């Protein structure tokens, strides 16, 4: 299936990486800043305009140029929302062991065309849309992140919105636990990476002893999330992990119609949602400001530090 | 619950989803839309001068339930006479409905919606609902229409039939018969509602829609099933390509806060608290709000600026919490990332020279560019209170504004600055 | 409220009323009683075996919002073939039926009442009742049936007609046309309306009856008003002379007990209390459980003997309050008048001779006959705890309820006596 991919999430200090609309605005900005950092930017690819050299390296047609003249082994992309389905339906053709797009605006329909095939293929794993990027810290950034607070170390952390990634991102660097691997698998409802993924990639690794998990209300993917972590991390040999609810105390809603909304769903995005957390083994926050401190209380309290 | 602070997904007035259904061909009663009693009474005389239903067009939770200014209960009335009806639209068009969801804030019925009344035999909901358990679109089906669904879904959830569709195949005939005869159609009618489904599938593939829901589909005394609502619930990503559709909407249901908003592409979330924010992302917009609430502190209308946005949106940002007069202090709590911090930085150096902005602004800056933004604050030389610690910027402006709603209270004047 | 304790008027199931009505030529639904799923099989197919409603005959305040132990919500269910007929009828006959005024002691569904379902047009409530104010019949009009009545009596009095009958002249034709006419019926079938309400007047003033409440009387989508519900309150006095309708009463609706009591001409009044009672008169009755109710009791279950009752009458009582179980202290508040004080005291040498009486009677006997009466209690030495002075009687009666429940946790006995 295709979630025989989820290992290609853990890039390492040795990993090309393209940047398909290299001279958008966002892209051509943070390109600069990707380079900057140490990421082995390798070249990138616009239609209509390639087969040229910006930036000191090669701009290309289509990603099977860049792919058969390079041989990158991933992809991000920043080409504008109405574009951006084709850009993805494009990258997976090409056979890209990672591609992350950042773009938001993306229609609902066209994503679930991009959706399908991807889950109909095995060898191409996609992170977004809607999302931050995904960084190994001092080896390699991919897509929207703030390199300049980030540390090597033993955290993995994992979340929906990217803004509240970036927060844990910072308070784990300040208590100077470091981070392992950190992901934004977005909070768009069709998203090519999800809770489980992350988890599990996490679990299976030693260089990682922390996740942090921060969600937010509306869906169930939380719900999933608490029972992977029962099922596979329960025990002893348990790794610690902490979790945020963002939006805990909110208003009640819109309640606009019925069907997809609660009639489908587990009506998660609550107060319960918490409850799932704790019953796992979660060790839950009750303030976005005080993350770096329960980790670093969690690590103590079981004496890893 | 629900989304809420993510987008505000269109939601059209009844009769452009009945016109919509209606050039789709699906299976519709005559429906007409009025703005004055004259038209009200044109229509009722053409469809028979008797038997009709008139409806209210106000977007709110509360339809059955709510009040109008002139004493009137509900936004469904049953007249039989085009002289009642023009009576009863008189207290209709032009009037404010109170509903719970408003509370008293209501939103004015600007037209009605004048339909002939048929008698339902059997009531079935029925509901095409893009979901991610599914990949894609679900058709759900139950026998259980005209009653609120979710009460019935929970206690019985065999009786919610729900069926998958595969979108690169589309949907064919013979899942529709399938579902028709799950839910428990007569014999004699399943192709008719085949039929419908057939079409409203091709309806919502067409106008990129997110959720059709029709409750209830009634079969009529006579056959033919009819469809009664049909409630649509829309994509906001689907703007740039769906320009018929975005373009009908109704803007009056909304404060003008929120068109201005919508306007530059600025989320915007009024609250019932007095400290304003401006956050970046929604997620970190719940975390503020999250850790103001826990400081005994309550926001008062925050919003969320995007990504990648310039100096002239967030300058029309700070006008539009300026705007609001409940806001006390206001806190900038954006953090690094796409959205490049120092535009953020000079549009607040901007906003608050140009519209005096006496009130405690708490920034917390970081991200991608902290030199450039902090040495611009620094060159500004203004009371922007620089801060760079969440819990300790949350503490600040809860303290500033309960300074600033005293010394409105003690009938004297503060400035604030940095300590030395 | 109401009057409750003053006599329980003989309401009769649905289906009771219901053929009283098709016998009387008022336009009615065809409707038919099952008591088993068979006959409503039959009943089923012979209507059409389509488009049928099915009723649980049920006397209860509760009955769309009640629940039955097999788990079906409602008594009324909407089925559209004979075999979910039979199916929904096995659910419902021979099951035990839980509304909030039972809480648990619900009544069994014996029968159910097999209908066509017929599509209301427009919805009126009518009622033709005895009254005081119009010291005599009254009809009562409206054109808000098939909702509660009492809302919109209160908010909107004016829609509420009330139209007075002189009896002697009986009931004119023009007074139904205008009773029609103002409630708003369409100017064609009035001439119906006014039919109907003089067969439903014959009706009222033929069997006896107190109050004919028709709601909703709905017009149907062909015309011919067709009477949907027909509750009747009939009049507990006229037991002698109306022997068909008050021998069809159903017994199983009630306590035993009630039945016993009533078998004897005893008023009963069954509580939640642990105190009985035996009173004079309803007014004594209000008042005994009033002055309990002061001294932090509560009466259990208390009767009224009525006037001029025998011996054999007040005995059958006291097997009655004794009965019960959850009885603690017993009081026997009977003041003299028409009920001859003296065969009270008889009653209650004879019954607690005979019965093995042993928990405390508190009596309390006066008027008309105090001699005999103190004379026999003293004769019979037993210990009839006399007392003579009401709210004495009642601190007394209290205080012995908890020595006795007292005495039951203590696991020891005791013998109440009069001081020396
Ligand atoms: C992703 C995003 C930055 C791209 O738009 P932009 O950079 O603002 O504007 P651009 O016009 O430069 O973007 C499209 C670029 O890609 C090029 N392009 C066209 N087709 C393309 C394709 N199929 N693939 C890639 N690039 C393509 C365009 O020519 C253009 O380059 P140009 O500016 O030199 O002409 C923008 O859509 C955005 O806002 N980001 C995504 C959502 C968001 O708000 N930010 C991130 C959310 S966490």
Same mark, same amino acid.
């Given at each position: ?34 380079? +900057? ?30 792919? +058969? ?34 773009? +938001? ?22 992170? /977004? ?8 810290? /001092? ?19 994992? &979340? ?54 921060? /969600? ?17 991390? &329960? ?62 209380? *969690? ?7 | ?64 339930? /709510? ?36 509370? *008293? ?37 139950? &026998? ?13 959830? +065999? ?42 599938? &091709? ?218």
């Amino acid at each position: 299936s295709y979630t025989a991919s989820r290992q290609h999430l853990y890039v390492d200090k040795n990993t090309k990486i393209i940047c398909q609309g290299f001279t958008g605005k966002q892209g051509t900005f943070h390109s600069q800043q990707a380079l +900057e950092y140490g990421t082995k930017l390798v070249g990138g690819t616009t239609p209509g305009k390639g087969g040229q050299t910006h930036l000191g390296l090669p701009v290309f047609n289509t990603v099977k140029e860049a792919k +058969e003249q390079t041989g990158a082994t991933a992809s991000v992309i920043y080409v504008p929302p109405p574009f951006a389905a084709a850009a993805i339906n494009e990258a997976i053709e090409a056979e890209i062991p990672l591609v992350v797009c950042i773009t +938001e605006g993306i229609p609902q329909q066209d994503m679930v065309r991009v959706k399908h095939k991807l889950l109909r293929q095995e060898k191409t794993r996609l992170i /977004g849309p809607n999302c931050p990027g995904v960084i190994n810290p /001092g080896e390699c950034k991919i897509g929207i992140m703030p390199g300049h607070i980030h540390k090597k170390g033993r955290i993995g952390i994992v &979340s929906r919105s990217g803004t509240l990634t970036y927060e844990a991102v910072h308070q784990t660097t300040q208590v100077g636990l470091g981070q392992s691997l950190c992901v934004g698998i977005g909070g768009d409802p069709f998203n090519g990476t999800d809770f489980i993924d992350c988890l599990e990639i996490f679990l299976n690794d030693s260089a990682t002893e922390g996740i942090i998990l921060i /969600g937010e209300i509306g869906g169930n993917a939380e719900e999933n999330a608490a029972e992977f972590l029962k099922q596979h991390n &329960s025990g002893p040999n348990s790794k610690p992990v902490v979790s945020f609810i963002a939006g805990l105390t909110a208003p009640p809603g819109r309640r606009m119609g019925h069907a997809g909304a609660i009639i489908a769903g587990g009506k998660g995005g609550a107060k319960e949602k918490i409850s799932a957390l704790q019953s796992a083994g979660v060790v839950v926050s009750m303030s976005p400001a005080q993350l770096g401190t329960t980790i670093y209380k *969690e690590f103590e309290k079981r004496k890893m530090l | 619950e629900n989304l809420y602070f993510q987008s505000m997904n269109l939601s059209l007035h009844e009769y452009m989803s009945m016109e919509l259904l209606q050039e789709a061909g699906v299976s519709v009663p005559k429906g007409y839309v009025a703005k004055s009693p004259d038209e009200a009474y044109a229509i009722a005389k053409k469809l028979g001068s008797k038997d009709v239903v008139i409806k209210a067009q106000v977007l709110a939770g509360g339809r059955g339930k /709510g009040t109008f200014e002139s004493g009137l209960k509900g936004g469904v009335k049953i007249v039989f006479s085009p002289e009642e009806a023009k009576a009863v639209s008189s207290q209709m068009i032009g009037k404010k409905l109170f509903t719970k969801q408003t509370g *008293e804030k209501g939103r004015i019925c600007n037209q009605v919606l004048v339909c002939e009344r048929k008698y339902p035999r059997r009531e079935y909901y029925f509901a095409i609902t893009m979901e991610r358990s599914f990949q894609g679109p679900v058709l759900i089906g139950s &026998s259980h229409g005209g009653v609120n669904i979710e009460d019935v879904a929970a206690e019985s959830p +065999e009786a919610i039939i729900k069926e998958p569709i595969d979108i690169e195949e589309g949907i064919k005939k013979e899942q529709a018969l399938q579902l028709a005869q799950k839910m428990g159609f007569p014999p004699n009618i399943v192709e008719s509602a085949a039929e419908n489904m057939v079409k409203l599938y &091709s309806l919502f593939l067409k106008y990129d829609a997110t959720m059709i829901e029709i409750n209830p589909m009634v079969e009529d005394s006579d056959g033919a099933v009819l469809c009664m609502d049909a409630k649509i619930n829309f994509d906001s990503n689907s703007a740039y390509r769906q320009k018929k559709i975005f373009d009908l909407q109704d803007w009056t249901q909304e404060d003008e806060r929120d068109k201005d908003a919508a306007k530059a592409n600025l989320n915007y979330i009024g609250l019932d608290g007095n400290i304003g924010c401006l956050v970046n992302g929604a997620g970190l917009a719940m975390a503020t709000m999250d850790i103001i609430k826990l400081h005994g502190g309550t926001p008062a209308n925050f919003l969320d600026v995007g990504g990648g946005a310039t100096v002239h949106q967030v300058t029309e940002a700070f006008k539009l919490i300026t705007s609001d007069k409940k806001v006390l202090a206001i806190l900038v709590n954006i953090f690094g990332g796409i959205m490049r911090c120092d535009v953020i930085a000079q549009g607040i150096v901007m906003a608050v020279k140009d519209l005096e902005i006496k009130i405690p602004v708490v920034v917390r800056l970081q991200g991608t560019r902290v030199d450039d933004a902090k040495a611009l604050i620094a060159d500004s030389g203004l009371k922007i209170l620089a801060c760079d610690d969440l819990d300790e910027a949350a503490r600040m402006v809860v303290k500033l504004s309960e300074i600033v709603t005293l010394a409105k209270q003690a009938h004297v004047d503060v400035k604030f600055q940095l300590p030395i």
